[PDB]
Design a protein around this ligand. Structure first.
Ligand code: CA
Ligand code: CA
Ligand code: CA
Length: 531
């Protein structure tokens, strides 16, 4: 009862009433009420500053609303912006949903997994199944433009440049956010003539290929540096590749690049000679910290020769590969500060004090009758499920799997498959570790309420105490908690949104841990809030 007519908003065929264009400052985390990019900010923190939900009341969390999502692998994220959730579904379905009520607003359906869409200005951006960079009108969901390049993690947009990697089975492109025009494209495999071609064991260029889903891009505004990682070469066996002895320059390399041009500023290969599908493409965070690595910390591999001990530095830090080794670099220069193993791993025999990795020759397939007991696995260790950062305690919080595989089983001495480590970013010391019988295989979200949210393959959605790792709240969803957790605020109410239902990884871990009720189904966004 406004006018005498019934004003309506037909779900799926409506427009956002008030859409404000998304800025660089939004994407840098400038509005705690929103979660406008995969990890909450450009810098990859996976953090919300919202603290209405905290250690004291999280035990009271209830289900506010949920909504069914497309069937298939459900690894996506509830991107939230001024009361609207922008939700990438499987099968290139993109929805705008009222973040308070769960009413569908609009739905774009293109003619599997989508980990995120991206926001910038007045448009919603994603990379489709048929390798188009696509822009939708944010307000209405109508197609604005699409450019055929020739993904699963989703782009980010930096100052009007849509940056998007590629699934390799291999490049990263920058595309104008308003016109659709491709601006640049970076490739990784050196051609004979370029530096590094001699690291490919004599394999002819036309027979080299890379393989791996492309990972999460992060960004530092002040340095104006985009960070991504490249994957390994395929197939995984260097004998089958014809690259025996080859360290494979270009592969499994962390790049820092200029967003307007793709120009490479610094790079560092975090895993040469990959024989283990290590995919060093996962998110690396930009954080400021005192630089004080403890050479005697558990798992520490080496400390950089001239590390700026005691100084404050903006660093690029985190675990880039399935191997589970955390790295820390100077964000601006790429100077190597330190590296630290987490899970049991035996593909890296050592890392010297300049960050040069030496792989374990004994884990390279040579004799077919020999036993090759590799740790971790093609699922990690870590995998694409993202870490989170707790700026209040300077902790890097990463979900892991305690697994090993014959080159899928629990690692030696581990009864719990699922694991979350919290690592001091200043010292590299592990401050706490949460473990549980089922594999997690799901991102975390860190919060200013001193909480860590994480889901599991046997459907448990948990909040951990960020100071101790102890579980303080849990619920259980219809299927494996397979997607991302985000948080946003509307009318003073903090919402915690998680995407669940199952993924490719759900079944591999249903097999290794036979005692847990890991099952797929009920794809959906599920949103929690206090009473
Ligand atoms: Ca526009
Ligand atoms: Ca993969
Ligand atoms: Ca064996």
């Amino acid at each position: 009862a406004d006018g005498a007519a019934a004003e309506t908003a037909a779900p799926g065929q409506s427009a956002i009433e008030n859409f404000q264009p998304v800025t660089a400052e939004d994407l840098a985390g400038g509005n705690a009420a929103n979660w406008p990019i995969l990890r909450g900010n450009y810098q990859g923190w996976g953090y919300t500053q919202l603290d209405q939900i905290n250690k004291d009341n999280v035990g009271q969390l209830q289900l506010a609303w949920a909504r069914t999502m497309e069937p298939g692998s459900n690894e996506g994220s509830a991107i939230a912006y001024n009361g609207v959730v922008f939700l990438g579904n499987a099968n290139d379905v993109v929805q705008a949903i009222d973040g308070k009520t769960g009413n569908l607003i609009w739905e774009y359906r293109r003619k599997a997994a989508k980990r995120s869409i991206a926001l910038f200005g007045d448009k919603v951006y994603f990379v489709s199944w048929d390798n188009f960079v696509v822009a939708l009108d944010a307000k209405t969901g109508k197609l604005a433009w699409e450019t055929n390049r020739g993904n699963s993690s989703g782009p980010i947009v930096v100052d009007g440049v849509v940056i998007a990697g590629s699934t390799c089975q291999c490049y990263v492109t920058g595309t104008d956010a308003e016109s659709g025009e491709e601006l640049w494209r970076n490739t990784f495999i050196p051609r004979p003539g370029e530096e590094g071609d001699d690291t490919w064991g004599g394999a002819p260029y036309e027979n080299r290929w890379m393989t791996g889903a492309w990972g999460q891009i992060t960004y530092d505004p002040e340095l104006d540096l985009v960070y991504y990682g490249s994957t390994g070469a395929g197939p995984a066996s260097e004998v089958q590749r014809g690259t025996e002895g080859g360290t494979l320059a270009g592969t499994n390399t962390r790049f820092a690049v200029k967003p307007k041009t793709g120009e490479v500023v610094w790079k560092h290969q975090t895993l040469p000679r990959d024989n283990w599908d290590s995919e060093c493409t996962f998110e690396m965070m930009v954080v400021s910290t005192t630089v004080n690595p403890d050479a005697g910390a558990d798992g520490m591999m080496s400390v950089g020769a001239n590390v700026p001990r005691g100084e404050t530095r903006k660093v690029l830090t985190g675990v880039p590969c399935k191997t589970g080794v955390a790295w820390q670099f100077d964000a601006e220069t790429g100077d190597y500060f330190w590296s630290k193993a987490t899970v049991e791993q035996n593909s890296i025999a050592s890392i010297d004090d300049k960050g040069l990795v030496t792989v374990n020759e004994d884990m390279i397939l040579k004799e077919p009758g020999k036993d090759y007991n590799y740790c971790p696995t093609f699922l990690g260790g870590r995998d694409w499920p993202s870490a989170g950062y707790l700026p209040k305690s300077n902790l890097y919080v990463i979900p892991l799997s305690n697994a090993c595989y014959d080159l899928v089983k629990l690692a030696p001495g581990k009864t719990n498959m699922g694991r979350v480590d919290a690592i001091d970013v200043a010292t590299g010391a592990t401050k706490w570790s949460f473990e549980t019988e089922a594999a997690l295989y799901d991102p975390v979200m860190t919060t200013a309420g001193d909480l860590v949210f994480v889901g599991s393959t046997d459907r448990m959605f948990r909040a951990l105490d960020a100071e101790t790792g102890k579980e303080v709240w849990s619920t259980r969803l219809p299927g494996a908690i397979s997607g991302y957790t985000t948080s946003y605020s509307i009318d003073g109410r903090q919402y915690v949104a998680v995407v669940a239902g199952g993924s490719l990884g759900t079944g591999f871990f249903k097999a290794a841990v036979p005692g847990v009720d890991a099952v797929q189904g009920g794809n959906g966004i599920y949103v929690f809030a206090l009473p």
